[PDB]
Design a protein around this ligand. Structure first.
Ligand SMILES: [K+]
Ligand SMILES: [K+]
Ligand SMILES: [K+]
Ligand code: NA
Ligand code: NA
Ligand code: NA
Lengths: 401, 401, 401
């Protein structure tokens, strides 16, 4: 539409990196592609990863940090080190920092639930770009071991290339059949990087795992549910959870807050602005619209600019620091918030009866600030008795189907 | 002149953002406009803001940090939060960090003194660019509330748009008279973002205010006078004050030192270099010349480069780390220094008899370093018995008017 | 060769900045010249500095930090401050942070040993660019004092320009003879910035110096030998030393680890990857080859990319975080490692029997990960009983000369 939305990143702007019959691994366009208004976010990327019941992403390490949030189902994740090796179950809500270089792999042990993970990634080397290192050799990726010379591999493993090749790599087989339809496996596990897993294996693999279930609190060891603490804002229109970095060792070096806002249908996250935090917002569920307010630099009276977009499962949108936002709900809307620059943030609501900086003004300034009489503004301001969330005067039925 | 001055930012390179009859709000060209030698300063901007007696900037928040220094007069500043609301008087000399997102507004309660504020700003979102958010609706800026849809505003305030509009915004009135001359007000306060204020109001507004007067010391709460501590360098040619970040909680996260150098007429801030700190220097008062020394990369003997410029009330100039500087005074010259990267800085004077790194040399190296005999250099070096500042052999009168 | 090596910086890509008959001062091309894959290293530069016995670099300060490592011989370094003045002997192995702005100069007191220093530099002002400030006036560089005006110099030193000029600078002499051959001196010390020194002087100059000899431990005061601690990895194929930033006050603000890997002939630093650290690797001695593994983004099965290069005294190469590396040795190969982003790094070996993350995998995942049976992989993996370094099945003789 005339006057576009730089800050809106619909579902579609995910580029598939990897689809096989067991899961997908999408990544979102670089925040600074079309826009040049989102430069401070040049490093961050958003990955959605998805898998089907009883499945396994093969071991991977990346040149990037990861903050996992399970927006759907269960997974055991394992994280492997030079020294120890770990494993956590993770339920809906759970988040987890995978540091940069950790060998990890994620199993979906559920029997009928797809796994849905959304990852913020912070590249280490180059800005907006990381890569996935697999030891596995599939028809889809090769091992890094392949990038070594036979001599080097042979010294390395202390083994005839022919034995390495047979065991770690794979042999010459340069044709094709790849037709006919049913389902089974390939090589050993449904070929590719996302493979089908046996219960035998799920049982073995989960047996080590540190169970979540109980909503674990932001520590430095295991997963932490974004609903662990009591809502920060809670009433009968929604819930607002949030873990600020300073109270969360696992990410405090990344200076990320994480939020989980549930907006009930016909409800409205009343307008606020984030004082220093740039928020990357992720739709898990529901439908709605938002209104972000900017000053159109463009290039008489300084014009403000609404940047609106419909919302739905999968979309990303971004909230620049200082920019007032508000968010509707046609259907029960659930949002995941990655707040960059979040340490010391303060969310300033602009309506209703808490953290309302407009009311916190000096009487006589309200006076000078708005055309109404002082008293008219206290009354008006006070007409919204709900805080944080309210009713949005929703649409409904009447002579309608 | 042939061989320009990248580092000099005369008064003129201020772009007005806002002039009405009550004050101005200028901002300085981005440090990396013409030059590409000033990249590390790409984020910082310098705002001068000015107002006339009994006046008020309307409430504003920005997507940027602010370090205020009052180079002229008095002001009450208020800073408003989701929770509390504060207010300080500020006299000449006082500085104050306005964090990013703080609702603030500045009154000039004086009866005949113009208020002069110089702000370093550090944008949060985008590099070299911030914006001003006002709830006010004037003939000059609109409210961010205007960027919301009527439906959204109506849910928000819990009020008929028509009542919001009447009280918080303003109504349709699409013509003009804007002629005839006298002075009074407009709407309620002299229209625009800088408005005329009543004593009734000044009295009320200042009644909360935490008075400065007494030269408050670098804390984390209120304003701090850049002359609070005893001069760091003081003799009969000038005074050199400076608050390093590590001894100043309010900015220590920004890693800014602030200086206040008064150079007496015909005096001379002897040549030094800042070891890590990049200094942004601001002329409050007086006239003089400076000499900055660089190595002209250009593109036989490596050539050095003087970058000189006359000085006067309002000018900015910048001192790259490591680059030797010296500053004259035709008239009593008063400078405000924003030292970026200032934590652990050490100012190395190169003449006179303190912090003189040339004299700190090994005898026998002086020997090898300069053409003179060792003894000739100790004597010479020692011919300047004043430290830090000295006499500049000024110009004066003789058969002259 | 088709498919170039961005990460390889042979000896040749050093640009001489300064050669006279007493030493050279080379600097390496900006890590982001040809490549745009090395952006996070845009600031760092590598300087090799070399001098001949009984010599002196004249006093210099830079707008950049320095981490010195002596890869050959001995030096006294002096570091001069506004306040105190210091001096350390430094033997092979020793490293030292010269902060930004420290007046320093380096003497080579040895009688027959050339001094070889390799410096990582981190510019302060501009990214990839620093400059050298000398008070000396040679036929090669001028003093910064020259960049001041006569009036300014005269106030400064409190001396007739004609006396300054005679003692600190040098006088007009605008011709040439610069022929005939023997050796002696010029002006006072072999002209230029690197000069010939007397024993009389070496004796005097070293008399202050804090002797190294004993392998001093990472403190915050003096030089620290990169072999101070016991090897981190040691067996009969090499030694691997490393000082991580958190255990080394002098650099912990720079977040640099330093390594010293000695690979014995026919030995092999087995393949690993650095989890967060980007390593800048410097060849002191020996010959060999390396294999770095990357994912060629390029632009069916994701291709990996070997980036190989022969090695020899002087070469630089770089190891991106996460990228597996391995290094051979034709001759006793000695490497200096500048690990950027090194705080919390963990080196993951991929072969042999320590810190082997492949073996740390879950049995049943190895199962799914490689084509071999689980048991075949444990056996194979276990066929390399040496850790860290091993034998490379080297080349040798047979019907050969
Ligand atoms: K929010
Ligand atoms: K200064
Ligand atoms: K290494
Ligand atoms: Na063997
Ligand atoms: Na109502
Ligand atoms: Na005199």
């Amino acid at each position: 539409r005339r006057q576009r939305n730089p800050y809106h990143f619909n579902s579609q702007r995910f580029q598939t990196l990897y689809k096989n019959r067991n899961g997908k691994i999408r990544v979102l366009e670089r925040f600074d592609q079309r826009t040049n208004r989102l430069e401070n976010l040049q490093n961050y990327r958003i990955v959605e990863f998805q898998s089907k019941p009883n499945t396994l992403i093969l071991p991977k390490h990346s040149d990037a940090d990861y903050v996992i949030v399970v927006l759907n189902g269960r997974a055991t994740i394992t994280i492997v080190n030079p020294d120890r090796r770990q494993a956590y179950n993770l339920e809906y809500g759970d988040a987890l920092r995978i540091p940069a270089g950790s060998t990890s792999y994620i199993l979906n042990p559920d029997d009928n639930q797809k796994l849905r993970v959304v990852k913020l990634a912070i590249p280490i080397n180059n800005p907006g770009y990381f890569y996935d290192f697999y030891p596995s050799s599939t028809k889809d990726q090769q091992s890094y071991f392949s990038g070594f010379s036979r001599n080097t591999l042979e010294a390395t493993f202390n083994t005839r290339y022919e034995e390495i090749q047979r065991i770690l790599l794979g042999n010459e087989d340069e044709q094709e059949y790849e037709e006919q339809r049913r389902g089974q496996e390939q090589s050993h596990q449904d070929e590719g990087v996302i493979v089908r897993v046996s219960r035998e294996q799920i049982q073995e693999l989960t047996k080590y795992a540190q169970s979540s279930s109980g909503k674990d609190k932001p520590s430095q060891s295991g997963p932490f549910n974004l609903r662990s603490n009591e809502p920060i804002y809670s009433n009968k229109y929604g819930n607002f959870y949030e873990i600020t970095p300073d109270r969360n060792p696992q990410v405090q070096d990344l200076d990320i807050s994480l939020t989980f806002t549930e907006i009930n249908e016909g409800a409205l996250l009343l307008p606020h602005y984030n004082s220093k935090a740039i928020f990357i917002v992720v739709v898990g569920e529901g439908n709605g619209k938002y209104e972000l307010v900017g000053i159109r630099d463009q290039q008489e009276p300084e014009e403000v600019r609404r940047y609106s977009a419909r919302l739905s499962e999968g979309d990303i949108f971004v909230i620049p620091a200082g920019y007032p936002i508000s968010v509707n709900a046609s259907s029960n809307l659930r949002l995941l918030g990655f707040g960059i620059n979040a340490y010391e943030n303060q969310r300033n609501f602009l309506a209703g009866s808490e953290d309302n900086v407009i009311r916190q003004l000096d009487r006589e300034v309200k006076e000078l600030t708005f055309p109404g009489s002082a008293e008219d503004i206290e009354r008006l301001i006070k007409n919204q008795q709900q805080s944080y969330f309210a009713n949005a005067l929703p649409q409904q039925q009447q002579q309608s189907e």
